[PDB]
């Protein structure tokens, strides 16, 4: 009910382009650890993920006006955890 919320948020809003941690729109801009340290502003850290979800980037939409801060934290922890544990799909 935090990490699960994040998984809940991931599935409902993120899976459309990040199915299984990949990136349908920008294939290279993947959700696994290596891609994140390479492409994510600020690097691989939960705070950088949060910032990208809130603000969006390029073809990635901003979720600040749709999700709560709490869910944005939750989903960032989820992405962070999946990449660290390499649990994608
Ligand atoms: C498709 C319309 C998208 C939805 C739905 C979400 N994201 Fe996304 N994301 C998408 C693109 C096109 C990009 C790259 C943007 C760019 O031009 O750089 C991204 C990137 C990410 C990343 C960074 C991945 C990396 O750099 O390797 C993260 C952390 C990310 N996206 C997370 C994320 C979450 C948690 C979403 C659900 C709320 C979400 N994205 C939705 C396309 C789309």
PDB file of C-alpha atoms and ligand atoms in Angstrom:
ATOM      1  CA  UNK A   1       0.000   0.000   0.000  1.00  0.00           C
ATOM      2  CA  UNK A   2       2.831   2.324  -1.089  1.00  0.00           C
ATOM      3  CA  UNK A   3       4.931   0.105  -3.286  1.00  0.00           C
ATOM      4  CA  UNK A   4       1.688  -1.570  -4.292  1.00  0.00           C
ATOM      5  CA  UNK A   5       0.124   1.848  -4.934  1.00  0.00           C
ATOM      6  CA  UNK A   6       3.047   2.544  -7.170  1.00  0.00           C
ATOM      7  CA  UNK A   7       2.552  -0.709  -9.012  1.00  0.00           C
ATOM      8  CA  UNK A   8      -1.092   0.237  -9.193  1.00  0.00           C
ATOM      9  CA  UNK A   9      -0.229   3.675 -10.563  1.00  0.00           C
ATOM     10  CA  UNK A  10       2.343   2.154 -12.982  1.00  0.00           C
ATOM     11  CA  UNK A  11      -0.178  -0.258 -14.486  1.00  0.00           C
ATOM     12  CA  UNK A  12      -2.992   2.197 -14.843  1.00  0.00           C
ATOM     13  CA  UNK A  13      -1.085   5.114 -16.350  1.00  0.00           C
ATOM     14  CA  UNK A  14       2.389   4.041 -17.436  1.00  0.00           C
ATOM     15  CA  UNK A  15       2.089   0.599 -19.010  1.00  0.00           C
ATOM     16  CA  UNK A  16       0.753   2.097 -22.249  1.00  0.00           C
ATOM     17  CA  UNK A  17       4.301   3.203 -23.229  1.00  0.00           C
ATOM     18  CA  UNK A  18       6.435   1.475 -20.559  1.00  0.00           C
ATOM     19  CA  UNK A  19       5.028  -2.004 -20.831  1.00  0.00           C
ATOM     20  CA  UNK A  20       7.459  -4.268 -19.054  1.00  0.00           C
ATOM     21  CA  UNK A  21       9.884  -1.407 -18.455  1.00  0.00           C
ATOM     22  CA  UNK A  22      10.486  -0.643 -22.151  1.00  0.00           C
ATOM     23  CA  UNK A  23       9.761   2.453 -24.172  1.00  0.00           C
ATOM     24  CA  UNK A  24       7.379   2.137 -27.126  1.00  0.00           C
ATOM     25  CA  UNK A  25       7.835   5.801 -28.215  1.00  0.00           C
ATOM     26  CA  UNK A  26      11.592   6.233 -27.797  1.00  0.00           C
ATOM     27  CA  UNK A  27      12.977   2.643 -27.789  1.00  0.00           C
ATOM     28  CA  UNK A  28      16.369   3.672 -26.380  1.00  0.00           C
ATOM     29  CA  UNK A  29      14.790   5.589 -23.367  1.00  0.00           C
ATOM     30  CA  UNK A  30      14.099   2.407 -21.425  1.00  0.00           C
ATOM     31  CA  UNK A  31      13.198   1.870 -17.703  1.00  0.00           C
ATOM     32  CA  UNK A  32      16.036  -0.392 -16.673  1.00  0.00           C
ATOM     33  CA  UNK A  33      18.941   0.857 -14.544  1.00  0.00           C
ATOM     34  CA  UNK A  34      21.517   1.319 -17.305  1.00  0.00           C
ATOM     35  CA  UNK A  35      19.210   3.409 -19.492  1.00  0.00           C
ATOM     36  CA  UNK A  36      18.148   5.561 -16.583  1.00  0.00           C
ATOM     37  CA  UNK A  37      21.728   6.502 -15.518  1.00  0.00           C
ATOM     38  CA  UNK A  38      22.396   7.399 -19.093  1.00  0.00           C
ATOM     39  CA  UNK A  39      19.267   9.371 -20.030  1.00  0.00           C
ATOM     40  CA  UNK A  40      17.642  10.519 -16.856  1.00  0.00           C
ATOM     41  CA  UNK A  41      18.294  14.129 -15.832  1.00  0.00           C
ATOM     42  CA  UNK A  42      20.095  13.999 -12.565  1.00  0.00           C
ATOM     43  CA  UNK A  43      20.846  10.304 -12.928  1.00  0.00           C
ATOM     44  CA  UNK A  44      19.448   7.138 -11.383  1.00  0.00           C
ATOM     45  CA  UNK A  45      17.727   8.246  -8.243  1.00  0.00           C
ATOM     46  CA  UNK A  46      14.183   8.209  -7.011  1.00  0.00           C
ATOM     47  CA  UNK A  47      14.115  12.032  -7.035  1.00  0.00           C
ATOM     48  CA  UNK A  48      15.019  12.255 -10.739  1.00  0.00           C
ATOM     49  CA  UNK A  49      12.217   9.873 -11.638  1.00  0.00           C
ATOM     50  CA  UNK A  50       9.747  11.918  -9.620  1.00  0.00           C
ATOM     51  CA  UNK A  51      10.784  15.086 -11.430  1.00  0.00           C
ATOM     52  CA  UNK A  52      10.379  13.556 -14.882  1.00  0.00           C
ATOM     53  CA  UNK A  53       6.858  12.194 -14.024  1.00  0.00           C
ATOM     54  CA  UNK A  54       5.734  15.587 -12.679  1.00  0.00           C
ATOM     55  CA  UNK A  55       7.182  17.624 -15.537  1.00  0.00           C
ATOM     56  CA  UNK A  56       7.202  15.165 -18.363  1.00  0.00           C
ATOM     57  CA  UNK A  57       9.744  15.369 -21.126  1.00  0.00           C
ATOM     58  CA  UNK A  58       9.411  15.422 -24.900  1.00  0.00           C
ATOM     59  CA  UNK A  59       6.798  12.911 -25.963  1.00  0.00           C
ATOM     60  CA  UNK A  60       6.373  11.911 -22.337  1.00  0.00           C
ATOM     61  CA  UNK A  61       3.374  13.686 -20.757  1.00  0.00           C
ATOM     62  CA  UNK A  62       3.362  15.539 -17.343  1.00  0.00           C
ATOM     63  CA  UNK A  63       1.307  13.837 -14.642  1.00  0.00           C
ATOM     64  CA  UNK A  64       1.339  16.556 -12.030  1.00  0.00           C
ATOM     65  CA  UNK A  65      -2.143  17.674 -12.977  1.00  0.00           C
ATOM     66  CA  UNK A  66      -3.550  14.146 -12.922  1.00  0.00           C
ATOM     67  CA  UNK A  67      -1.829  12.246 -10.058  1.00  0.00           C
ATOM     68  CA  UNK A  68      -1.291  13.142  -6.442  1.00  0.00           C
ATOM     69  CA  UNK A  69       2.186  13.922  -5.047  1.00  0.00           C
ATOM     70  CA  UNK A  70       1.798  10.776  -3.006  1.00  0.00           C
ATOM     71  CA  UNK A  71       1.161   8.585  -6.034  1.00  0.00           C
ATOM     72  CA  UNK A  72       3.961  10.252  -7.964  1.00  0.00           C
ATOM     73  CA  UNK A  73       6.329   9.333  -5.087  1.00  0.00           C
ATOM     74  CA  UNK A  74       4.863   5.853  -5.011  1.00  0.00           C
ATOM     75  CA  UNK A  75       5.311   5.236  -8.727  1.00  0.00           C
ATOM     76  CA  UNK A  76       8.831   6.638  -8.701  1.00  0.00           C
ATOM     77  CA  UNK A  77       9.814   4.203  -5.919  1.00  0.00           C
ATOM     78  CA  UNK A  78       8.305   1.410  -7.941  1.00  0.00           C
ATOM     79  CA  UNK A  79      10.294   2.250 -11.096  1.00  0.00           C
ATOM     80  CA  UNK A  80      13.360   2.754  -8.995  1.00  0.00           C
ATOM     81  CA  UNK A  81      12.852  -0.676  -7.297  1.00  0.00           C
ATOM     82  CA  UNK A  82      12.124  -2.608 -10.465  1.00  0.00           C
ATOM     83  CA  UNK A  83      15.254  -1.226 -12.129  1.00  0.00           C
ATOM     84  CA  UNK A  84      17.457  -1.821  -9.097  1.00  0.00           C
ATOM     85  CA  UNK A  85      16.118  -5.398  -8.648  1.00  0.00           C
ATOM     86  CA  UNK A  86      15.963  -5.756 -12.431  1.00  0.00           C
ATOM     87  CA  UNK A  87      12.453  -7.152 -12.063  1.00  0.00           C
ATOM     88  CA  UNK A  88      11.228  -5.913 -15.437  1.00  0.00           C
ATOM     89  CA  UNK A  89       8.644  -8.388 -16.874  1.00  0.00           C
TER      90      UNK A  89
HETATM   91  C1  LIG B   1       3.635   7.434 -23.528  1.00  0.00           C
HETATM   92  C2  LIG B   1       2.622   8.373 -24.062  1.00  0.00           C
HETATM   93  C3  LIG B   1       4.180   7.575 -22.248  1.00  0.00           C
HETATM   94  C4  LIG B   1       3.472   7.375 -21.100  1.00  0.00           C
HETATM   95  C5  LIG B   1       2.048   6.753 -20.973  1.00  0.00           C
HETATM   96  C6  LIG B   1       4.534   7.540 -20.079  1.00  0.00           C
HETATM   97  N1  LIG B   1       5.799   7.758 -20.620  1.00  0.00           N
HETATM   98 FE1  LIG B   1       7.592   7.771 -19.600  1.00  0.00          FE
HETATM   99  N2  LIG B   1       8.446   8.182 -21.258  1.00  0.00           N
HETATM  100  C7  LIG B   1       7.894   8.242 -22.556  1.00  0.00           C
HETATM  101  C8  LIG B   1       8.861   8.840 -23.472  1.00  0.00           C
HETATM  102  C9  LIG B   1       8.579   9.175 -24.920  1.00  0.00           C
HETATM  103  C10 LIG B   1       9.968   9.054 -22.699  1.00  0.00           C
HETATM  104  C11 LIG B   1      11.287   9.606 -23.059  1.00  0.00           C
HETATM  105  C12 LIG B   1      11.174  11.110 -23.064  1.00  0.00           C
HETATM  106  C13 LIG B   1      12.357  11.733 -23.726  1.00  0.00           C
HETATM  107  O1  LIG B   1      12.202  12.298 -24.828  1.00  0.00           O
HETATM  108  O2  LIG B   1      13.459  11.606 -23.156  1.00  0.00           O
HETATM  109  C14 LIG B   1       9.768   8.619 -21.398  1.00  0.00           C
HETATM  110  C15 LIG B   1      10.798   8.460 -20.440  1.00  0.00           C
HETATM  111  C16 LIG B   1      10.557   7.963 -19.135  1.00  0.00           C
HETATM  112  C17 LIG B   1      11.504   7.825 -18.127  1.00  0.00           C
HETATM  113  C18 LIG B   1      12.995   7.959 -18.385  1.00  0.00           C
HETATM  114  C19 LIG B   1      13.510   6.717 -19.090  1.00  0.00           C
HETATM  115  C20 LIG B   1      14.943   6.867 -19.550  1.00  0.00           C
HETATM  116  O3  LIG B   1      15.445   7.995 -19.617  1.00  0.00           O
HETATM  117  O4  LIG B   1      15.576   5.858 -19.874  1.00  0.00           O
HETATM  118  C21 LIG B   1      10.871   7.559 -16.949  1.00  0.00           C
HETATM  119  C22 LIG B   1      11.383   7.412 -15.531  1.00  0.00           C
HETATM  120  C23 LIG B   1       9.525   7.462 -17.268  1.00  0.00           C
HETATM  121  N3  LIG B   1       9.318   7.711 -18.645  1.00  0.00           N
HETATM  122  C24 LIG B   1       8.514   7.088 -16.306  1.00  0.00           C
HETATM  123  C25 LIG B   1       7.118   7.102 -16.616  1.00  0.00           C
HETATM  124  C26 LIG B   1       6.099   6.801 -15.693  1.00  0.00           C
HETATM  125  C27 LIG B   1       6.468   6.316 -14.270  1.00  0.00           C
HETATM  126  C28 LIG B   1       4.870   6.923 -16.309  1.00  0.00           C
HETATM  127  C29 LIG B   1       3.558   6.693 -15.801  1.00  0.00           C
HETATM  128  C30 LIG B   1       2.950   7.634 -14.985  1.00  0.00           C
HETATM  129  C31 LIG B   1       5.213   7.338 -17.641  1.00  0.00           C
HETATM  130  N4  LIG B   1       6.574   7.419 -17.852  1.00  0.00           N
HETATM  131  C32 LIG B   1       4.299   7.383 -18.689  1.00  0.00           C
HETATM  132  C33 LIG B   1       6.568   7.969 -22.879  1.00  0.00           C
HETATM  133  C34 LIG B   1       5.568   7.780 -21.950  1.00  0.00           C
END
